[PDB]
Amino acid sequence: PAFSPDQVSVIFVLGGPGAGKGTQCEKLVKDYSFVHLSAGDLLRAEQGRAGSQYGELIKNCIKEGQIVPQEITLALLRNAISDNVKANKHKFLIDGFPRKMDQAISFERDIVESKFILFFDCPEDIMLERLLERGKTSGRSDDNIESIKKRFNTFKETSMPVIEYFETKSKVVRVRCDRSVEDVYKDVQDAIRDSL
Numbered sequence: 001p002a003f004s005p006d007q008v009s010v011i012f013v014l015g016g017p018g019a020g021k022g023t024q025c026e027k028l029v030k031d032y033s034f035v036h037l038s039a040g041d042l043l044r045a046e047q048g049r050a051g052s053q054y055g056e057l058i059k060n061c062i063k064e065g066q067i068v069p070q071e072i073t074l075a076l077l078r079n080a081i082s083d084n085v086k087a088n089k090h091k092f093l094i095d096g097f098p099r100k101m102d103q104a105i106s107f108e109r110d111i112v113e114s115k116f117i118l119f120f121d122c123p124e125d126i127m128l129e130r131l132l133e134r135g136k137t138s139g140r141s142d143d144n145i146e147s148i149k150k151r152f153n154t155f156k157e158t159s160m161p162v163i164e165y166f167e168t169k170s171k172v173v174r175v176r177c178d179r180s181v182e183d184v185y186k187d188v189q190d191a192i193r194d195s196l
C-alpha cells in the first residue's frame with residue numbers, strides 16, 4: 001500500500017444517503033484530530049472544476065445515483081489524503097467511500113488498509129424523510145425523489161455488499177442513525193473510544 005496503517009489511520013464512514021454521515025463527521029472533527037474527507041464532496045468539487053474532463057460524467061452519475069468509476073474516485077481521494085499527510089494530518093474519516101467492491105479492494109491494496117468501518121445502520125423511511133427535508137433546506141441537485149430512489153437502489157445493490165465484506169473481517173462497527181443528532185453522536189463517540 002502507499003501507506004502503512006501506522007502512518008495513516010483510515011476509518012470508513014458508511015451508510016445510505018441521509019443516514020447522518022456528514023453530520024456526525026463534522027461533529028467528530030471538532031472533538032478529534034481526524035480530517036473529514038467526503039467522497040461526495042470531492043466528486044462535486046471536481047465536477048465544477050474549470051478544465052475538468054470529468055464534469056459531465058460526474059454530473060450524470062450523481063443525478064442517476066450511480067457509482068462514479070473508481071479510477072476517478074480513487075484519484076481524487078488519493079490526492080486529498082496526500083495533501084493532508086503532507087500537512088501532517090494522519091487520521092481520516094472518509095465518508096461515503098468505499099461504495100463498491102472494486103474501489104474498496106483497490107483502496108485497501110494501493111493506499112492503506114482501513115482501521116475500521118463506522119456503519120450508520122439506518123431505516124430507509126428515516127433516510128428518505130431526512131433527504132426530502134435536506135432537499136428543501138439545501139437544494140442539492142440529487143436530493144429529489146427520482147434521484148433519491150436511484151441512490152437507495154444503488155446503496156442496497158452495490159454498497160451493501162461492501163458492508164458484508166468488511167463485516168466478515170470483523171471491521172464493522174454499527175451505529176443506529178435513527179436518534180437525535182446528540183444521541184447518535186454519543187454512540188459514535190463510544191464506538192470511536194472503544195475502537196482506538
Ligand SMILES: Nc1ncnc2c1ncn2[C@@H]1O[C@H](COP(=O)(O)OP(=O)(O)O)[C@@H](O)[C@H]1O
Pocket residue numbers: 015016017018019020021022023024130131133134137177178179180181182184
Ligand atoms: N440524527 C439526525 N436526526 C435528524 N436529522 C438529521 C440527523 N442527522 C443528520 N440529520 C440531517 O438529515 C440530513 C441528512 O444528514 P447528512 O448528515 O447530511 O447525511 P449523509 O451524509 O449520510 O448523506 C441533513 O439535512 C442533516 O441535517
Ligand SMILES: Nc1ncnc2c1ncn2[C@@H]1O[C@H](COP(=O)(O)O)[C@@H](O)[C@H]1O
Pocket residue numbers: 017039040041043061062063064065066067068069073096097098099100103151
Ligand atoms: N465512493 C463513491 N464512489 C463513486 N461515486 C460516489 C462515491 N460517493 C459518492 N458518489 C456519488 O456522488 C453522489 C453523492 O454522494 P453523497 O454526497 O455521499 O450522497 C452519489 O450518489 C454517487 O453518485
